[PDB]
Design a protein around this ligand. Structure first.
Ligand SMILES: *[C@@H]1O[C@H](CO)[C@@H](O[C@@H]2O[C@H](CO)[C@@H](O)[C@H](O)[C@H]2NC(C)=O)[C@H](O)[C@H]1NC(C)=O
Ligand SMILES: CC(=O)N[C@@H]1[C@@H](O)[C@H](O)[C@@H](CO)O[C@H]1O
Ligand SMILES: CC(=O)N[C@@H]1[C@@H](O)[C@H](O)[C@@H](CO)O[C@H]1O
Ligand SMILES: *[C@@H]1O[C@H](CO)[C@@H](O)[C@H](O)[C@H]1NC(C)=O
Ligand SMILES: *[C@@H]1O[C@H](CO)[C@@H](O)[C@H](O)[C@H]1NC(C)=O
Ligand SMILES: *[C@@H]1O[C@H](CO)[C@@H](O)[C@H](O)[C@H]1NC(C)=O
Lengths: 49, 175, 47, 118, 49
């Protein structure tokens, strides 16, 4: 999920306002990427034995 | 393990070599060569004291954990599985390996037929794992990844304070 | 006068197993021990 | 499923010691297991050898270990001291004793002579 | 509990192959297990009944 897009729909002002909040979007994106990598690793370990 | 076991001063295990896994008395730190390599391999640690963050000390110092591991190793070498299920019972390492071979379905006699071959293979495997750990940097990926994740989480938490959230400045006193 | 004392913990009692290439310890008597193991199953569920 | 409905070979799973059986009991939002475990109590020094040579052929215990009460040699269970006279039934033959290190010459009784004595 | 204090009969639990014993080792916030495993090496055809 693109945090910037979901919170702000192609809006410059909303993006500027969110930039002040901090690194919430980066943290959420990192968590989602880690979840996806964990799913891939689970599939590999369960099947590729 | 309730008790603490130590190997005898003389190491005569029928050709088996455990020097690479037992503690080294010479060095001030009583840790094995593999343990020393693992400790050296791992490298945002001392900077974690600025704004209320504190790192509570580990209850079990690395020396105590090393002592526990050494006791487990000595018990396994001198007695086998007996010390883990009651009173520790001594037994030659050759006979312990024979018991293991019987456990995995292989006949006892084979081990006594070429005990030297098994001892040499075990020593070679120990050396091979030592070399692989020395020459490979991704072996300890799990612990380094966990440490990096914790460090970056702490850094993000600290940096979140910089956000002003619409205020003139993030400093409470100034605003 | 008993009081509070701080000390470095001892990780058990040191033991020196009499190990040699031709020595074994075969037990002669046994015991039956009953040990308790507590395991939560559910929790104080609420809505 | 494991400790109660069967015997678990896992170490320190159904309590400390050699698990024999377990008994479940209820408790408020929890369960209690009374793991029964066999545990060796009394030990004793013994002199053991990997195998026994009788007539140039190595002898290995079929199920047990060789021990000695100072002078005589017997074959006993690993987890209990039940010495038995060495016999062809107790131990199985293999190769020759010139290869193994630690083997000690010993005599093994044969029932054939007393059987033919009549 | 299983690999070190005993011989594990589980498959691919204490290292791939017929497990024999393991040697624990400490590490910063972690443990390392050196699982020893018997593995067949040389095979041959055989006529069996
Ligand atoms: C080791 O055990 C053997 C078998 O019991 C002993 O041999 C016999 O022991 C009985 C004990 O009542 C004696 O009456 C016999 O005279 C023994 N036979 C022989 C040929 O000696 C043996 O004495 C034991 N040795 C030790 C040191 O305990
Ligand atoms: C049971 C025990 O503690 N034995 C030791 C002994 O091994 C050692 O040689 C002696 C030295 O003073 O002290 C005592
Ligand atoms: C006098 C004599 O035979 N001494 C030997 C010794 O050289 C050898 O190292 C030892 C092996 O355990 O057995 C004994
Ligand atoms: C085991 O190897 C070390 C070097 O790696 C050597 O010093 C030691 O002597 C070996 N063990 C025996 C019993 O010789
Ligand atoms: C074996 O003998 C040694 C010394 O002779 C003794 O310290 C040890 O306790 C004996 N074995 C057992 C299981 O007690
Ligand atoms: C068994 O025989 C087949 C065909 O004869 C051969 O391909 C195979 O390699 C043999 N087994 C082994 C372990 O080589």
């Amino acid at each position: 999920v693109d945090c910037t897009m979901y919170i702000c729909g192609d809006s410059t002002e909303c993006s500027n306002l969110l930039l002040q909040y901090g690194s919430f979007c980066t943290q959420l994106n990192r968590a989602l990427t880690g979840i996806a990598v964990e799913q891939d690793k689970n599939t590999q370990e369960v099947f590729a034995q | 393990v309730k008790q603490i076991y130590k190997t005898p001063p003389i190491k005569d295990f029928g050709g088996f070599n455990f020097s690479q896994i037992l503690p080294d008395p010479s060095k001030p730190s009583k840790r094995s060569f593999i343990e020393d390599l693992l400790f050296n391999k791992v490298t945002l640690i001392c900077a974690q004291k600025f704004n209320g963050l504190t790192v509570l000390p580990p209850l079990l110092t690395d020396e105590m954990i090393a002592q526990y591991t050494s006791a487990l190793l000595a018990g396994t070498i001198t007695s086998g599985w007996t010390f883990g299920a009651g009173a520790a019972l001594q037994i030659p390492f050759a006979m312990q390996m024979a018991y293991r071979f019987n456990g995995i379905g292989v006949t006892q006699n084979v081990l006594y037929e070429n005990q030297k071959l098994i001892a040499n293979q075990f020593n070679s495997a120990i050396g091979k794992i030592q070399d692989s750990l020395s020459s490979t940097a991704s072996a300890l990926g799990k612990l380094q990844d966990v440490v990096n994740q914790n460090a970056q989480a702490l850094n993000t938490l600290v940096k979140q304070l910089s956000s002003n959230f619409g205020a003139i400045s993030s400093v409470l006193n100034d605003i | 006068s008993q009081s509070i004392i701080a000390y470095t913990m001892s990780l058990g009692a040191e033991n020196s197993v009499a190990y040699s290439n031709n020595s074994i310890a075969i037990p002669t008597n046994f015991t039956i021990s009953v040990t308790t193991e507590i395991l939560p199953v559910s929790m104080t569920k609420t809505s | 499923s494991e400790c109660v409905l069967g015997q678990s070979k896992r170490v320190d799973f159904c309590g400390k010691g050699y698990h024999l059986m377990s008994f479940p009991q209820s408790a408020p939002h929890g369960v209690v297991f009374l793991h029964v475990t066999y545990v060796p109590a009394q030990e004793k020094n013994f002199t053991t050898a990997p195998a026994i040579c009788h007539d140039g052929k190595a002898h290995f215990p079929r199920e047990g270990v060789f021990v000695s009460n100072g002078t005589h040699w017997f074959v006993t269970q690993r987890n209990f001291y039940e010495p038995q006279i060495i016999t062809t039934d107790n131990t199985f033959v293999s190769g020759n004793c010139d290869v193994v290190i630690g083997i000690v010459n010993n005599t093994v009784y044969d029932p054939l002579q007393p059987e033919l004595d009549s």
